[PDB]
Amino acid sequence: MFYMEFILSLIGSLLLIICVLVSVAFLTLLERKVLGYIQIRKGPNKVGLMGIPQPFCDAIKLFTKEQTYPLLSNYLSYYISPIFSLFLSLFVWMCMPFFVKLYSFNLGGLFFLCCTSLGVYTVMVAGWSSNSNYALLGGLRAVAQTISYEVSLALILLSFIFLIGSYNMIYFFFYQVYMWFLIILFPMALVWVSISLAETNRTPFDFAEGESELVSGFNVEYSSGGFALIFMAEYASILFMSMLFCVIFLGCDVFNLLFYMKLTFISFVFIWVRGTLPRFRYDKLMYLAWKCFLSFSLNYLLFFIGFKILLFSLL
Amino acid sequence: EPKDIVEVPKGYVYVNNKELSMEFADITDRAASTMFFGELLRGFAVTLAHIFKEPATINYPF
Amino acid sequence: LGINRLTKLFQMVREAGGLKQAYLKLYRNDDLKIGTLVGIDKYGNKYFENPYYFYGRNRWIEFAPHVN
Amino acid sequence: MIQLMLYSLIITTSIIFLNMIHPLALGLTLLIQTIFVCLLTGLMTKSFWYSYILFLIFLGGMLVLFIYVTSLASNEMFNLSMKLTLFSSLILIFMLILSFIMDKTSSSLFLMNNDMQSIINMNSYFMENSLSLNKLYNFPTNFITILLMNYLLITLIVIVKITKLFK
Amino acid sequence: AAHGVLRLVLELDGETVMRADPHIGLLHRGTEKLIEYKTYTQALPYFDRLDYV
Amino acid sequence: LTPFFWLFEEREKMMEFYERVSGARMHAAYIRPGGVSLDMPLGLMDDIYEFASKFAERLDEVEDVLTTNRIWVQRTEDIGIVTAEEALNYGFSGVMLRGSGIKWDLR
Amino acid sequence: QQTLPVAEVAQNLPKKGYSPFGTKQSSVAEWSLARLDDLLNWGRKGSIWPLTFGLACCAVEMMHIAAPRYDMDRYGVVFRASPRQADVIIVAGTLTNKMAPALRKVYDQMPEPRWVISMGSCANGGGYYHYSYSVVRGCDRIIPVDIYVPGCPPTAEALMYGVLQLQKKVKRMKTLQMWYRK
Amino acid sequence: MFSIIFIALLILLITTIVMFLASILSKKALIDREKSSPFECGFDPKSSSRLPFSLRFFLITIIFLIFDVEIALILPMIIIMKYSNIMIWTITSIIFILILLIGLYHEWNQGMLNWSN
Amino acid sequence: RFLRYYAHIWRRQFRSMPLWHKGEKTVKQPVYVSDVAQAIINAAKDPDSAGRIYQAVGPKRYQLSELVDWFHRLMRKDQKRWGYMRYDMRWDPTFLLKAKLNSFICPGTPIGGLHPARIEREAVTDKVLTGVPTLEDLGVTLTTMEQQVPWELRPYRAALYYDAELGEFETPSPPKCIEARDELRLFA
Amino acid sequence: MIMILYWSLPMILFILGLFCFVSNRKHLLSMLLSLEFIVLMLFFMLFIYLNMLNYESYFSMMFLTFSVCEGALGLSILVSMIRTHGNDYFQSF
Ligand code: SF4
């Protein structure tokens, strides 16, 4: 009955939270192994049996490591941002689609836009709390990157949204029931990888945390426990985008293991980029954001709007 | 091959004298490369391949 | 799939002494390979060489068991 | 209950807003206010469509300017006062217990959410935003949208005219 | 990317670098004087240390 | 990262060669005023041959990966133009000078 | 000086245990605190993050260790650039007077438990530049060194052997077990 | 919704509890004058270090807002397309995007991102 | 123990340091640590100091109210808003519970050294005696608080509000010693 | 009373916003932020009315599009003003 409904809804949310957290913490190893073999390294195979408990080992180190809090009175404000970031990276999951009702969450695309937007405030205030020009430059560069890409991200969404005829994500499954949707929108997939990669701040768009240009960007002044939360937040983010890529382009077959095979392959693909590409410049990226992607997205918008008008004409 | 841009004597090799053609097949090639990232695809497949080479790590201290 | 590779696994795993005697070896050395007893050390160590691998892997050592 | 608790949280944050003077502390205060107001309007609406909208425009993009230019930082970080927090907690709680006391219904709005419409209403069985946003595009009330977009175009012509004072 | 040694004192506006003062000398190991005190054969490794790549 | 690691694999082979002749990974003392300090061990010639044999493959792998890549090209190209006259009067040399256009070289 | 036992002596002896403390604990509190120390040391031992200071000549070996021949992340070691996130500092190369305050500052900005490896002779005792007007004779005079890796430079094997020795030191550290006595 | 609200509150509470817990699990150390300085690669931080606010980043974010609002205008096209009159929905939407392109291409010839500084 | 105690948060109430008798019936004469150490070595090198007590005290006695006010001036704790007040520890019965609980809970050293024994210490006055030798007998110059403490507490300076003015606030005007007759007035 | 139970909360917040708009602040940023809070309240009054109305609801965008433009203009003149004088501080006024 009714309270059966609510109890399960909370169990599912809680159950998903532990899984996504343990997955991303455990996924970190797969980055370290996989990148280890892109390079001709062997990757972690030392601790436990073949480095399986490597990420648990990492967490124990961090939580034991003290919290080298910055200048005297910043305690809270420096302690806020990691919470307010890991929260977004997790809670963004709850809109993800199921056939087995977790929610009746409509406007899921809008909610995606919103959560992906809120990352700016976390990084920016984090740098501001740190109060170190290195951290501050990182935040500004991080802010500019995310804010710029959201513009293209929105219009890109709309192409799919029109092609499915609603904002409810679930209809991606019904429209993909015959033939996958990548093979229709191939260029969008490459662009969407880049947009997703920009959001999660991975390379080639690695300006926010980065290395060798800023020490760690905003992350530079973060002690252990805060750092662990930021680091987990980023990987919860990289997984979610991998899921969103899977549900849009590659079948949305939530009740089929092949969907989870596809999750791993896409998250692998993110790493596959990590070990291959070099980094962009500031300005060249902004050209790529406004002068290249926005034009691209508008054309497809004007292309598919006509197509659906023609489609509506036919039926 | 496209012609050079500076005539070279021996004992040297200019590494940029090659001209960027304006022939239509040549521009469309480059355009298609940018529109579908062929060069990235070449590099992408390289690293996939090079997973399949056995790592050269010595299992120290054994 | 298993092109005469699972066979090789069977050789090393079984003649190790079973599940326990394959896992403890793996658990300790972080790898399990096949060679020949080049010579037994004076101090319990055992040396193994196999030209099948390359120079990094050519020769290796199983330290004395009492060193846990 | 959620509705009047949400009044209470907005009241408390409003008292926070009028006290705080550090620009980040104020800008932080706006951020919370926006979530609360989005929640509240959503409850009394037919759906949360407009709530998601103004969230991503007002908060998501436009408060970025305010925080960013108010990154003046005062040159120093907050001296947080656990006292206004405790008063904030204190004022919240007995407002919250009063919320538990107050009349369940009469203390609620009267607006008609999609659920609080009658069953017979044949119109209500459409997509929740279809019939609401219809005449934003259908004539003869759609040209005003054209005025909006050109207004925004002109807004950019203005910004580059003000933000381009010799540098 | 700073070789571990180099220390650039940079003055930036926006993000561009206007004045870039490099402070070479964070490594200087008085090797000219030492080379003087030792013998030619002894002095030889000094040069291999220099430009160690 | 990938270029650096792939090449630093091959850097190990070359250092081993220094180790074979001189006895030190780096920082040999092998060149001395009267010629090299010491003769070479037999077979080092051949090992050099195979190493040179494979180096074309290794260098080309990274070369094809990275020379053409757009990010790298735009990331480096047209950075810090060094005109010929400005190069000389500042006392340049090496591939910097040789890159700017000057046909000079000490060899 | 001692020497390894001989074949038959090894035969008599049992397994050397895993936790270096042993398993002779008397009471529940002792036995429990022994395990928690073991877990802590296991965490701090398995994952260790150098800072990559690497001033000079020695640094090249500090890179070859990262290279794929004697892989170091294999052991759970990663080069975090930011000292706030780095757990260990491999001071390598010479410490000139201009650098001395910098090294000090970097060291104590790093949070503890912090261990320093003094790689190379230049850091160990000033190395080959010991009688120089500009060099800190050793790095013991600026920071507390934990492990010394002799060499000029140390061969990469030597360096990561020392890393393992640091892991052993990280393994046997007694913090909870002996707080109980404190 | 409030099902969503409660779940977020629960997560946030669990999140802060975890970080609260780590704050006690991590050993303390006696504070140090220098351990709490801004990180400037190991050389003393300069004066206040508060960056100049004479820059363009607000200008880019203002372009964001214009396009961010314009995005808002075009969001509902998905649903109304089944209901609205087709001429008006067709032309009205088309001129939106067309004006955007022309604004963009006109603005490339302006080239405003290639500032002199 | 001394300055960290008077600086740490738990020692403070909301913004109201509680002091025994408002900290206005206490005489303290702290000394700087290095000058104590330098005394130790100098008396270790000399064996003729053997078998001699030494009252180690600073140059100028002080009143705890003078110190804490000066401390808060140094820390910029008194400009407009941070709002320092001094209670009577006897009036408020909450400070003791903080000490008792803080002791009972912390396994290691209690947070900020809040254990009651520290509280009794601040209450106790500093009774020197003549004849008992001193640092001057040990040939040790004594850096005063006026030279040492400002830099000492510089890390804990804070409260640079956006609402108010900073920087131009004068250097913290030093405290004022307590003389023998003035002490006899204090104790009446 | 209808307004006292329904339109009261919007009033109390709106008046508090204005008073903060006419208070004392080191620069004008607190003012702009003050009127910004007022806009959110302005939206609040506007929406509860547009909710009285079956489909007139959509007018939110019109108000929102206009309101953000005021804020942008607000930040525009301020930021140009720092750049002019090297500061936009109320002491300059
Ligand atoms: S110790 Fe040797 S290898 Fe290290 S920096 Fe000095 S000379 Fe170079």
Residue numbers in the entry:
A (entry chain H): 1 to 315
B (entry chain I): 32 to 93
C (entry chain q): 5 to 72
D (entry chain J): 1 to 167
E (entry chain D): 95 to 147
F (entry chain D): 202 to 308
G (entry chain B): 40 to 221
H (entry chain A): 1 to 117
Authors' description from the paper:
Respiratory complex I powers ATP synthesis by oxidative phosphorylation, exploiting the energy from NADH oxidation by ubiquinone to drive protons across an energy-transducing membrane. Here, we isolate complex I from Drosophila and determine its structure, revealing a 43-subunit assembly with high structural homology to its 45-subunit mammalian counterpart, including a hitherto unknown homologue to subunit NDUFA3. Cryo-EM particle classification identified three distinct states in our preparation of Drosophila complex I, which we refer to as Dm1, Dm2, and Dm3.
